[PDB]
Design a protein around this motif. Structure first.
Motif, PDB file in Angstrom:
ATOM      1  N   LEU A  71       0.827  -1.194   0.000  1.00 26.74           N
ATOM      2  CA  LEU A  71       0.000   0.000   0.000  1.00 26.74           C
ATOM      3  C   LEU A  71       0.857   1.236   0.000  1.00 26.74           C
ATOM      4  O   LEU A  71       1.892   1.338   0.670  1.00 26.74           O
ATOM      5  CB  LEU A  71      -0.917   0.056   1.217  1.00 26.74           C
ATOM      6  N   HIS A  72       0.397   2.202  -0.755  1.00 26.61           N
ATOM      7  CA  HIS A  72       0.931   3.532  -0.614  1.00 26.61           C
ATOM      8  C   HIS A  72      -0.175   4.458  -0.126  1.00 26.61           C
ATOM      9  O   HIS A  72      -1.241   4.431  -0.640  1.00 26.61           O
ATOM     10  CB  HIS A  72       1.481   4.062  -1.904  1.00 26.61           C
ATOM     11  N   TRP A  73       0.111   5.184   0.958  1.00 31.51           N
ATOM     12  CA  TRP A  73      -0.835   6.094   1.590  1.00 31.51           C
ATOM     13  C   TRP A  73      -0.664   7.458   0.926  1.00 31.51           C
ATOM     14  O   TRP A  73       0.001   8.354   1.436  1.00 31.51           O
ATOM     15  CB  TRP A  73      -0.586   6.135   3.101  1.00 31.51           C
ATOM     16  N   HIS A  74      -1.288   7.593  -0.238  1.00 32.55           N
ATOM     17  CA  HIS A  74      -0.988   8.692  -1.116  1.00 32.55           C
ATOM     18  C   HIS A  74      -1.436  10.066  -0.668  1.00 32.55           C
ATOM     19  O   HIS A  74      -2.568  10.261  -0.376  1.00 32.55           O
ATOM     20  CB  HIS A  74      -1.535   8.410  -2.504  1.00 32.55           C
ATOM     21  N   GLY A  75      -0.458  10.948  -0.484  1.00 36.67           N
ATOM     22  CA  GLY A  75      -0.732  12.272   0.027  1.00 36.67           C
ATOM     23  C   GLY A  75      -0.536  12.449   1.533  1.00 36.67           C
ATOM     24  O   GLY A  75      -0.481  13.574   2.003  1.00 36.67           O
ATOM     25  N   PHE A 109      -7.510  12.034   0.233  1.00 30.48           N
ATOM     26  CA  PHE A 109      -6.278  11.314  -0.034  1.00 30.48           C
ATOM     27  C   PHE A 109      -6.701   9.970  -0.607  1.00 30.48           C
ATOM     28  O   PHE A 109      -7.890   9.748  -0.870  1.00 30.48           O
ATOM     29  CB  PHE A 109      -5.485  11.170   1.283  1.00 30.48           C
ATOM     30  N   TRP A 110      -5.745   9.082  -0.868  1.00 32.72           N
ATOM     31  CA  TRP A 110      -6.141   7.785  -1.392  1.00 32.72           C
ATOM     32  C   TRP A 110      -5.077   6.737  -1.169  1.00 32.72           C
ATOM     33  O   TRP A 110      -3.971   7.053  -0.748  1.00 32.72           O
ATOM     34  CB  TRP A 110      -6.584   7.866  -2.869  1.00 32.72           C
ATOM     35  N   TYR A 111      -5.444   5.489  -1.394  1.00 36.88           N
ATOM     36  CA  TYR A 111      -4.508   4.379  -1.227  1.00 36.88           C
ATOM     37  C   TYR A 111      -4.523   3.505  -2.461  1.00 36.88           C
ATOM     38  O   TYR A 111      -5.567   3.318  -3.090  1.00 36.88           O
ATOM     39  CB  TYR A 111      -4.804   3.563   0.042  1.00 36.88           C
ATOM     40  N   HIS A 112      -3.344   2.993  -2.812  1.00 33.58           N
ATOM     41  CA  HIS A 112      -3.174   2.105  -3.926  1.00 33.58           C
ATOM     42  C   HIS A 112      -1.810   1.452  -3.892  1.00 33.58           C
ATOM     43  O   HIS A 112      -1.038   1.808  -3.078  1.00 33.58           O
ATOM     44  CB  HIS A 112      -3.316   2.863  -5.189  1.00 33.58           C
ATOM     45  N   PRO A 113      -1.537   0.489  -4.776  1.00 34.14           N
ATOM     46  CA  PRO A 113      -0.202  -0.131  -4.705  1.00 34.14           C
ATOM     47  C   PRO A 113       0.938   0.794  -5.173  1.00 34.14           C
ATOM     48  O   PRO A 113       0.760   1.705  -5.985  1.00 34.14           O
ATOM     49  CB  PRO A 113      -0.321  -1.325  -5.665  1.00 34.14           C
ATOM     50  N   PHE A 372       3.980  15.184 -11.701  1.00 33.81           N
ATOM     51  CA  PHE A 372       5.091  14.849 -10.816  1.00 33.81           C
ATOM     52  C   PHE A 372       4.615  14.690  -9.380  1.00 33.81           C
ATOM     53  O   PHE A 372       3.995  15.591  -8.829  1.00 33.81           O
ATOM     54  CB  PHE A 372       6.120  15.969 -10.872  1.00 33.81           C
ATOM     55  N   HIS A 373       4.903  13.537  -8.793  1.00 35.45           N
ATOM     56  CA  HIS A 373       4.485  13.240  -7.427  1.00 35.45           C
ATOM     57  C   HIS A 373       5.660  13.003  -6.490  1.00 35.45           C
ATOM     58  O   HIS A 373       6.562  12.328  -6.831  1.00 35.45           O
ATOM     59  CB  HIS A 373       3.612  12.027  -7.428  1.00 35.45           C
ATOM     60  N   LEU A 374       5.574  13.551  -5.279  1.00 34.22           N
ATOM     61  CA  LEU A 374       6.568  13.314  -4.238  1.00 34.22           C
ATOM     62  C   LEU A 374       5.845  12.676  -3.056  1.00 34.22           C
ATOM     63  O   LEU A 374       4.842  13.216  -2.567  1.00 34.22           O
ATOM     64  CB  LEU A 374       7.185  14.644  -3.792  1.00 34.22           C
ATOM     65  N   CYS A 422       6.873  10.189 -11.715  1.00 36.60           N
ATOM     66  CA  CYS A 422       5.774  10.545 -12.556  1.00 36.60           C
ATOM     67  C   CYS A 422       4.520   9.765 -12.143  1.00 36.60           C
ATOM     68  O   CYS A 422       4.607   8.636 -11.844  1.00 36.60           O
ATOM     69  CB  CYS A 422       6.072  10.212 -14.010  1.00 36.60           C
ATOM     70  N   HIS A 423       3.366  10.413 -12.172  1.00 39.62           N
ATOM     71  CA  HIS A 423       2.129   9.727 -11.859  1.00 39.62           C
ATOM     72  C   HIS A 423       1.297   9.308 -13.024  1.00 39.62           C
ATOM     73  O   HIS A 423       0.195   8.934 -12.831  1.00 39.62           O
ATOM     74  CB  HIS A 423       1.241  10.437 -10.822  1.00 39.62           C
ATOM     75  N   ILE A 424       1.859   9.355 -14.210  1.00 45.16           N
ATOM     76  CA  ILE A 424       1.382   8.450 -15.248  1.00 45.16           C
ATOM     77  C   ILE A 424       2.108   7.164 -14.876  1.00 45.16           C
ATOM     78  O   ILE A 424       3.310   7.036 -15.083  1.00 45.16           O
ATOM     79  CB  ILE A 424       1.708   8.956 -16.643  1.00 45.16           C
TER      80      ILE A 424
HETATM   81 HG   LIG Z   1      -0.403   7.633  -6.067  1.00 42.64          HG
END
Ligand SMILES: [Hg+2]
Ligand SMILES: [Hg+2]
Ligand SMILES: [Hg+2]
Ligand SMILES: [Hg+2]
Length: 439
Positions: A71-75, A109-113, A372-374, A422-424
């Motif tokens: 899981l990535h706890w995005h944001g 926020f969101w979660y995904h692999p 672009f995501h950090l 990159c978030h593509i």
């Molecule tokens: Hg993400």
């Protein structure tokens, strides 16, 4: 059920959200057809987790996929020892994520692999859900009395009752699908009961952009990816790139049916042609317009007044270092680079100091849009393409069109090793990612 489908919500209880989720191939009915997706909690999207600052989250993920996942706890500005982009949960195994929700936090926020090389097929297949951090700001009457909905914007393509496989071209462009869905539904109807709507928006697509416009209405932006703006900002349209979130108020102006559309947008995706010489890449041009949902206004709508203020944005300490990160492409090889290199998990690219502020100049020297995501460290976008940003708010994804430079103010928060990419997501899987170590 309700006319407007939204994921089931799981709320913290007594300051604790304790939940077991399985990542599992799941037969379901989607867009009028039967398909097997990969899901969390047996649904697409996954359940929405709704928490408050200082809550404890205890989430055990069981992997019932035939490949590793995580899981990535995005944001979420939490520790990368918890939100660990290098962790692999093997098939059949489980892992418990435990963290506290930061005090000064609000938003969608969101979660995904996030496992290098595996993100694009897993996300495309359905592995995603939202996480909402409630705020005391939500109690002000101008928001409290609004009708609230989550819109998870995600497209899909099906083949033989399963998510369509990635083609070579999909690895070059990022995969988009023909089913352009909201909360897993095809063009749902939202029959509004209130004149003011509060919509939380999530682009959970691999690569598709949503140039959002509601017929006959402006939108009032009140939050970006990771927090509130300082005051509402009126916009005629709102572009959400992959990974981005926003919250808007909609003030319904008269009775009737209004389409929420994803207007045509050219993100620089490419096709291949052969015209008697060349067998070379050619621009796909803008996406076709899509209707996302039908919005029905109530009788004699009288919208609430807008909030005059939301949340004051912190002025950050003066920065101690400037970075430059240049994005480039080798399209025909489906390879993507930051400062001339592809990702290597063993290699640290940037070393920064916790509790200092950095300026990051991110330059897109490719021809495609690159968002672009950090991880871990939300940022303030100062300007993009030499144009100053019209608001202050926390973001964690910033879209760059070809040639554009984004200037970001990046406070470094939690210590440890994390990533930026990159978030593509196909571009990340194909190398457009680097490692930041904070000490
Ligand atoms: Hg993400
Ligand atoms: Hg990631
Ligand atoms: Hg051509
Ligand atoms: Hg990219």
């Amino acid at each position: 059920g309700p006319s407007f489908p939204e994921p089931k919500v799981v709320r913290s209880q007594g300051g604790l959200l304790s939940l077991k989720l399985s990542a599992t191939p799941t037969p379901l009915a989607i867009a009028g057809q039967r398909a097997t997706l990969l899901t969390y909690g047996g649904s697409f999207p996954g359940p929405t987790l709704r928490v408050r600052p200082r809550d404890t989250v205890r989430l055990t993920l069981e992997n019932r996929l035939p490949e590793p996942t995580n899981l990535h706890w995005h944001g979420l500005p939490i520790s990368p020892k918890v939100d660990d982009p290098f962790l692999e949960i093997p098939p059949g195994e489980s892992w418990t994520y435990e963290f506290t929700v930061p005090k000064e936090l609000a938003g969608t926020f969101w979660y995904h692999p996030h496992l290098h090389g595996r993100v694009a097929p897993q996300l495309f297949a359905g592995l995603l859900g939202a996480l909402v951090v409630e705020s005391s700001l939500d109690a002000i009457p101008e928001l409290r009395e609004a009708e609230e909905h989550l819109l998870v914007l995600k497209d899909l393509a099906l083949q033989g009752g399963r998510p369509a496989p990635h083609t070579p071209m999909d690895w070059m462009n990022g995969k988009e699908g023909d089913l352009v869905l909201v909360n897993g539904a095809l063009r749902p109807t939202l029959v509004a009961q209130k004149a003011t709507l509060r919509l939380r928006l999530l682009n959970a697509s691999n690569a598709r952009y949503y140039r959002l416009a509601l017929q006959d209405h402006p939108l009032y932006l009140i939050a970006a990816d990771g927090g509130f703006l300082e005051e509402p900002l009126e916009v005629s349209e709102l572009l959400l790139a992959p990974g981005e979130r926003a919250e808007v108020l909609v003030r319904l102006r008269k009775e009737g049916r209004f389409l929420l559309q994803a207007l045509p947008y050219d993100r620089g995706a490419m096709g291949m042609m052969d015209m008697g010489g060349m067998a070379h890449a050619m621009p796909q041009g803008p996406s076709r317009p899509e209707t996302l949902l039908y919005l029905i206004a109530p009788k004699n709508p009288k919208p609430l007044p807008l909030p005059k203020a939301l949340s004051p944005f912190p002025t950050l300490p003066a920065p101690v270092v400037t970075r430059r990160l240049v994005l480039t492409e080798d399209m025909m090889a489906a390879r993507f680079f930051i400062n001339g290199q592809v990702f290597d998990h063993r290699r640290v690219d940037l070393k920064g100091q916790a509790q200092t502020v950095e300026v990051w100049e991110v330059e897109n020297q490719g021809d495609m849009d690159h968002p672009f995501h950090l991880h871990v460290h939300p940022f303030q976008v100062l300007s993009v393409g030499g144009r100053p940003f019209p608001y202050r708010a926390w973001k964690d994804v910033v879209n760059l069109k070809a040639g554009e430079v984004a200037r970001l103010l990046v406070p470094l928060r939690e210590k440890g090793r994390t990533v930026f990419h990159c978030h593509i997501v196909e571009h990340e899987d194909r190398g457009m990612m680097g490692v930041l170590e904070v000490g």
